[PDB]
Design a protein around this ligand. Structure first.
Ligand SMILES: CCC[C@@H](NC(=O)c1cccc2c1CC(=O)N2)[C@@H](O)c1cccc(Cl)c1C
Length: 357
């Protein structure tokens, strides 16, 4: 897909901002779902408000026409909404707009038809009930999986955007199931937590990378998704995060060479929740959240700004005579989950503490 390189750069920009903030925290977000939400929001924006959003998603507006960006997002959504993808992946965007605002019909039509998102009218005069209605939409949309997503709403809220993505992870290849034996996971030098570990001896798409100083393992999942796990060598996590590029990842995805290996793979479910106003502001997306926002494509008469923007991402695990290498994913590791048809980054992150709340 034409916009995959831009989404890859957005994934790295967002990942590196979060990793810079704290080196002890888990990171788990969807570059694809966040960018889709903000490209959608951009249809109701104009001038510097609009340009800041697309440049914030790593689209250089002097090189790529806007029509190709929206076509790229619509094609991506078509791929993600295919039956087999829908079996494992649920994605959605909820726009909550203050009642009594005269909404632009073209924006509502473009949101539903092009981005498959829902726009709702809500009473923000009752901030506790509005927060309940938003959370009920997310809970209904995720069949109970995501609850109390919006913990607090500002008193002056007139417009909220909620972006969610849920992935049911299951290995595509049938494997000889073993007991998930509890094993040590070295969070750091003095911290160890127990995790269910699946032990396997087989032919795996695994290699040790000199450039990245890491073991690199590629695994296939139901829903046309491939995960790439980077297990850094001792003291090389920062080097790994610094050296990652889109071209390096493409080379890994094109490789089909396999080798015998004894792997210890933790059966981990992961979640990430972000305040996009804070995170995206550091990437230069600020005007749409300010009093000066040009949201005249959403409402023509009244002033409007995006008061609240939240992202929630959830992954749950469903379910040679020479001694081969033994690789245990029993310490912090970085990951990317790619959609196979588009090569888009569905998820990106790092597991530091598997039992982190
Ligand atoms: C290092 C491996 C981590 C992942 N584990 C598995 O996929 C796993 C482990 C044990 C048993 C079973 C599975 C899959 C299955 O069907 N059975 C997983 O926890 C995960 C962690 C963070 C990010 C990502 Cl993308 C994913 C997918």
């Amino acid at each position: 897909n034409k916009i995959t390189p831009n989404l890859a750069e957005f994934a790295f920009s967002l990942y590196r901002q979060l990793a810079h903030q704290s080196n002890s925290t888990n990171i788990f977000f969807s570059p694809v779902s966040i960018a889709t939400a903000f490209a959608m929001l951009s249809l109701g924006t104009k001038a510097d408000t609009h340009d800041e959003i697309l440049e914030g998603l790593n689209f250089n507006l002097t090189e790529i026409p806007e029509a190709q960006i929206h076509e790229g997002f619509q094609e991506l959504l078509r791929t993600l909404n295919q039956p087999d993808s829908q079996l494992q992946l649920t994605t959605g965007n909820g726009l909550f707009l203050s009642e009594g605002l005269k909404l632009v019909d073209k924006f509502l039509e473009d949101v539903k038809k092009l981005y498959h998102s829902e726009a709702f009218t809500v009473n923000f005069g009752d901030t506790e009930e509005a927060k309940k209605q938003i959370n009920d939409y997310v809970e209904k949309g995720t069949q109970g999986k995501i609850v109390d997503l919006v913990k607090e709403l500002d008193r002056d809220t007139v417009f909220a955007l909620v972006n969610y993505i849920f992935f049911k992870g299951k290995w595509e290849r049938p494997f000889e199931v073993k007991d998930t034996e509890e094993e040590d996971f070295h969070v750091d030098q003095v911290t160890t937590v127990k995790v269910p570990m699946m032990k396997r001896l087989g032919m795996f798409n695994i290699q040790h990378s000199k450039k990245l100083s890491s073991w690199v393992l590629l695994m296939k999942y139901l829903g046309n998704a491939t995960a790439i796990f980077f297990l850094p060598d001792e003291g090389k996590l920062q080097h790994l995060e610094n050296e990652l590029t889109h071209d390096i990842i493409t080379k890994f995805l094109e490789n089909e060479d396999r080798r015998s290996a004894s792997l210890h793979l933790p059966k981990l479910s992961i979640t990430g929740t972000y305040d996009l106003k804070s995170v995206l502001g550091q990437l230069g997306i600020t005007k749409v959240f300010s009093n000066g926002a040009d949201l005249s494509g959403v409402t023509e008469e009244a002033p409007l700004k995006l008061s609240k923007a939240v992202h929630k991402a959830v992954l749950t695990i469903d379910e040679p005579m020479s001694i081969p290498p033994e690789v245990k994913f029993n310490k912090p590791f970085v990951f990317l989950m790619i959609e196979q048809n588009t090569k888009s980054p569905l998820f990106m992150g790092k597991v530091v503490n598997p039992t982190q709340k």
